[PDB]
Amino acid sequence: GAMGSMERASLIQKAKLAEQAERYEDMAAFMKGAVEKGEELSCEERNLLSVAYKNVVGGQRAAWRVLSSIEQKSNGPEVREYREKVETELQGVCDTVLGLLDSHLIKEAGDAESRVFYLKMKGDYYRYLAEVATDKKRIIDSARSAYQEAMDISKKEMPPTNPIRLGLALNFSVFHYEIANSPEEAISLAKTTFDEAMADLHTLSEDSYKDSTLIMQLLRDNLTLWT
């Protein structure tokens, strides 16, 4: 790509600068270029990749929902055309991230912390595709499959307070609630995840305790809205 001539270390340094400048499209392009160097990513670098694309796709999702809402109220071609333009761009960003995971981040990820991180991402980006899908069943099953593999590994290999495990369960619970139309599964998962984390907090340092309880508060926030 356009980043082929830049050093890996320079792409990572510029991803960090772009984050400070709130230049998330640049941050994502620099991190795509770092991934395409073909070396595995460190924990910090995986987090830069995820923050970059989460910010980009989050702008697109927010724009898509505004346009879809206008379109639904309206029922000329312009609202549909413009919602389709934003949808196509969102789908492209999802396919780009899914392409990086499949070529070749997941297959080289052997540690639980990396493997679960990337499989969680794969579920998340299929979930974003599912949000705009009307193909839809197969997209939902792809999200479910990725989340389930990440959950199976996380349960075997990580303590229940592990923030990656917690963030996975959070996102899988929202998948259940509003993509799979399984609100009871969503509530059961969020409750079991919170309760098993609560019981392991005694094992943590002050800093690990802060990281785990921040995500546990997100599970509680959802449970409050769902019950």
Partner: peptide, 12 residues
Amino acid sequence: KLMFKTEGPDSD
């Protein structure tokens, strides 16, 4: 749409 809490930047 009411969006539920998901992991990481609340960028939407």
